[PDB]
Design a protein around this ligand. Structure first.
Ligand SMILES: C[C@@H]1O[C@@H](Oc2ccc([N+](=O)[O-])cc2)[C@@H](O)[C@H](O)[C@@H]1O
Ligand SMILES: C[C@@H]1O[C@@H](Oc2ccc([N+](=O)[O-])cc2)[C@@H](O)[C@H](O)[C@@H]1O
Ligand SMILES: C[C@@H]1O[C@@H](Oc2ccc([N+](=O)[O-])cc2)[C@@H](O)[C@H](O)[C@@H]1O
Ligand SMILES: C[C@@H]1O[C@@H](Oc2ccc([N+](=O)[O-])cc2)[C@@H](O)[C@H](O)[C@@H]1O
Lengths: 328, 322, 322, 328
């Protein structure tokens, strides 16, 4: 598995959060999301009927996988990691199992993950996938209904508004009929997958976690799995901000990654213009890299499928700083 | 009789909304000027590509009733909407031109009609803005004689899809689009209190008289702004730099940030106190404040615009009890 | 009677002001954390250099009367000032330590004395904040046992001028500076309604009891916040994360931007509506809102803080007539 | 005069606005200056007695000419131009003729212009001077009392509050007793002066302009004089924004300069965080340079004598962009 050597020297990856949440852009009926605009459905308890209707308005005329991959490559990013399905349960690929997806439900009627997979394959960039294996707000038995004594970036971890009957919920039904089928689809279509990125599990049993692990192993032997799946079921450690060294979980292969966003939201938010400066981005990358940690830097695409102007500017200027610094 | 009402109106909402709103001040990694609604001229976007934005126009949250409720809660007594801006895209159902919000967009609804009705019901007067000179969708759109002066885009006219300047002839555009479209908006959509025209550059004296007489005939009580032509108006539109003939009616238009059209990158919202003080200064001088909102791609008043309007009203009411 | 008064006070102004204010969130081309007042720890600025800021402290526009006028106009019934923060610089005339605003600065005036008088005259209650544990100017300042937890600076203690951790001894600092200074502020400056202590880390249970008894003796009617020590307080200081004590007295402290001390780079001012709604939510739960202002180097309430406080009050009054 | 050849290839200069205005930082009694914070005295008609008292609070502990010149040089700036005296009439050098200066009136009790002159001399950077030869709000006969049919960045062009009797004013008294003496001082002390930068004249006679021209010529033979002095009395043209070429006043030596600021104020302003991005700064510089026009980019020092953090970041990132570009 050359992927271990490659990942230890990759240093830099682009992450992409994009979905129906992007159309609301951090705002609902005159009121603000939390820092996390992608959590807006939970934040305002938007019924599935209304939220899902955003699919009818999803027509990102300027989306261009080739150009997004070109930007990542120009910044020295060696891989890319996209939301296949976030907490809202809306798939960004053509899902045989669930018609609640970007291909079937939207006038755009295209496979975002497929286009990025191809663009990456052509450019020489590795391709990785993010799936919300626990939380799913579209599913009556979506996870997080046992976790609501801890506050969130929305209201509840689960969809507790369309599905109020907590005691009647049963994650097994959602796992068996949606999660595992969808994981099999994304790990089967879309070619070689370098990296698999799972959410923080809360509802999943040890059994259900082992299943996902074995499934990925079988379908994508050379895929590196992040630590957020389950203990002993990963190839690299995802470090939270509170876990970076100054200037735990064992790492058997010596592989590490911290994910960040350029402003304070993962999803696009009109109101969030708090973009980290080129120098902040470059310095943070250099500090992680010096500690043998990969920087996975999020872009939140806008409703027309564009990298925000200020995100693009700050990525390119951080690269100019880095290249200047690395001569001498 | 609208003369008495207009002298005491004090406060109006203006609305800029169109295909420009979907691009939201940004095109291929670059910024519009302060005026996001000028973005097509700014980047010389071909009509084929720009017009295609119509296919993506589906503002799920647009709600005329709620927009008029906000205006009325702020003490605004009237509302003035873009029926067609410089891009030449009509925001009503135009018999004359299929390049409109009803025929060209999946939303497939008449924005002006809905606002007209909401206004009528709420007791708010209704006014219309039409670009009678500039039209970037029309081969003979105006501004092809005016390009020795800089703009909020590139050229005043569409000089990219229509490069042959000397072969242009505004009469064809005036006769076949401008005057027909003015007749439609002044015929459908009920009583019109206010008619708001752009800065004329190409229009002849004749063409200006025609528009004046047309509005007079179709909408006898409609007050016409000074930007049409000298001696062809009922009230003066003052620029900020002009606050000191009027046969005694006056209006200054402003926007809450620095753009008329919606712009993601422009978060330079004037504070409640700025909005209230400016209103009080204009009002004290017998001048109406026409305050622009630029609706977002889902048809929403931006959160910060709504907050600042409501807080300015709270300041004004507090002040007016002292 | 202070118990009854505090349960119905609802609203207080807090003030963070010191040498930190002159650096204003910036040191040698780099940013403080969100907490600009922690800047000395953040950059490990030696006492010799940091203390030299005293030579530049000349806030020509400081005006206790006007600051109290603003607080009173916003319905604030009390005021709470930093007498000495973590940097160990007293903002009153301290007999015990020459490292104070009177002796060390050209301004050569007693900030706490002026505010005490302005409050007394306006009918506003007066409260004092003292850092009883951390003191970065003192060789035996607290926090040298707490550095396995990260801070808004580097270390909790001054570990740069005073590196030898194992040789430090908080008793020397407590006996010779903390308790003397607490006695001064609780003796001069008249009746004290409220005593606001920092989160203790180094203090013994004994040292906490001493402060409690000292305040009780010198200022019998002073209400003491919960941050002193368990069973040694009259009201609970709640963090936001602690909203769903025997006298039923509660207070949550907040700042208008994200810093307690003034920071030129921090323009993230909470909107009037955010401020008003948060106040209303705390008040509905029987919790007092203590809202921080961070005075600028000339002793001014920042323009945007003043605007947002006044607009929040206008929203509140409008709402409370509905 | 090698200065003509040198100026045609200089491309890039730092400008500095700094004075009592800097302490008020765009704010007075709860209210905002215009975009131009340095005009704040006119904006609020602050009496000379109160405004001048700011001198007592002027103690910029962090001012460091050596470091400011280091920054300019790191950004490829080949010269530096400082306010010796702006419209407020407060000199930033030790003036024999007027005690209303940074040396005599302030506890800092040092010569800003002298320190920068020396730092520049040592670093190999040319040194230029800005003097307000017309407007002077401290002087009873300061200019602009004939010009108040045009609006300003303050209230009136002249100090019309301390000196209300417009018809009794006489600029000759101010010119003879302050302007020309002060110009002689700055052109005599402070070594070789590469560039002389005058304000837009409104009150000055043709005679008074000729005098300044001849004075500079005699005292500083190789000093290049900007066009804002008087027609036929200049070596290079100062172009206003509205005069830059696309996709007048003749220039006999073919010398051109446009001055700009990084935010929207020349003087420091707390409230103005509208910093032009690295890419804006670099692109504008490249466009001017391609047209043989020098870019004179203003920094407005803060009350402690610091280059604002975001101004320093944007200058350095613009340089990184420029160097990256110039290797492509
Ligand atoms: C990448 C993000 O992950 C989760 O929330 C977290 C969980 C862990 C961290 N972390 O510590 O880096 C940050 C956000 C999601 O809830 C969020 O919407 C986004 O997808
Ligand atoms: C209401 C605005 O008017 C026009 O442009 C202007 C705006 C103001 C003036 N004025 O008053 O100077 C002149 C042209 C339009 O170009 C702009 O997009 C918007 O429609
Ligand atoms: C009022 C603030 O108090 C402390 O910081 C804290 C410490 C603990 C909490 N808390 O846990 O509620 C809040 C602020 C100080 O560090 C800070 O400078 C400011 O004075
Ligand atoms: C460098 C600047 O010069 C003047 O302001 C200007 C500058 C340029 C023009 N111009 O070209 O129109 C008008 C006023 C001064 O008023 C300002 O404070 C600063 O010193």
């Amino acid at each position: 598995n050359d992927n271990v050597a490659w990942f230890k020297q990759a240093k830099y990856g682009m992450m992409i959060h994009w979905g129906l949440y992007s159309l609301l852009a951090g705002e609902y009926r005159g009121e603000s999301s939390s820092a996390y605009a992608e959590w807006i459905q939970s934040k305002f308890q938007i019924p599935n009927a209304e939220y899902g209707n955003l699919a009818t308005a999803f027509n990102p005329l300027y989306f261009d996988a080739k150009k997004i991959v070109a930007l990542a490559k120009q910044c020295g990013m060696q891989y890319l990691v996209v939301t296949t399905k976030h907490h809202d349960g809306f798939a960004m690929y053509h899902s045989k199992v669930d018609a609640y997806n970007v291909y079937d439900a939207t006038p755009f009627h295209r496979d975002i993950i497929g286009e990025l997979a191809e663009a990456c394959q052509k450019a020489g960039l590795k391709f990785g996938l993010y799936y919300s294996q626990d939380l799913d707000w579209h599913d009556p038995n979506g996870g997080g209904y046992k976790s609501n004594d801890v506050e969130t970036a929305g209201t509840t971890w689960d969809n507790s508004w369309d599905f109020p009957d907590e005691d009647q919920k049963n994650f097994d039904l959602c796992f068996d009929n949606k999660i595992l089928p969808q994981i099999k689809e994304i790990m089967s279509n879309y070619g070689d997958i370098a990296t698999a990125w799972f959410a923080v599990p809360m509802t999943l049993s040890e059994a259900q976690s082992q299943t996902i692990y074995d499934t990925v192993r079988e379908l994508q032997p050379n895929c590196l799995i992040n630590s957020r799946l389950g203990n002993g079921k990963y190839d690299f450690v995802s470090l939270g901000d509170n876990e970076i060294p100054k200037n735990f979980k064992p790492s058997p292969l010596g592989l590490y990654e911290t994910a960040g966003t350029i402003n304070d939201s993962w999803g696009f938010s009109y109101h969030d213009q708090n973009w980290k400066t080129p120098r902040t981005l470059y310095r943070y990358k250099q500090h992680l890299n010096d500690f043998g940690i990969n920087y996975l830097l999020n872009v939140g695409l806008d409703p027309l499928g564009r990298v925000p102007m200020m995100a693009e500017e700050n990525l390119l200027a951080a690269k100019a700083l880095e290249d200047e610094a690395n001569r001498l």
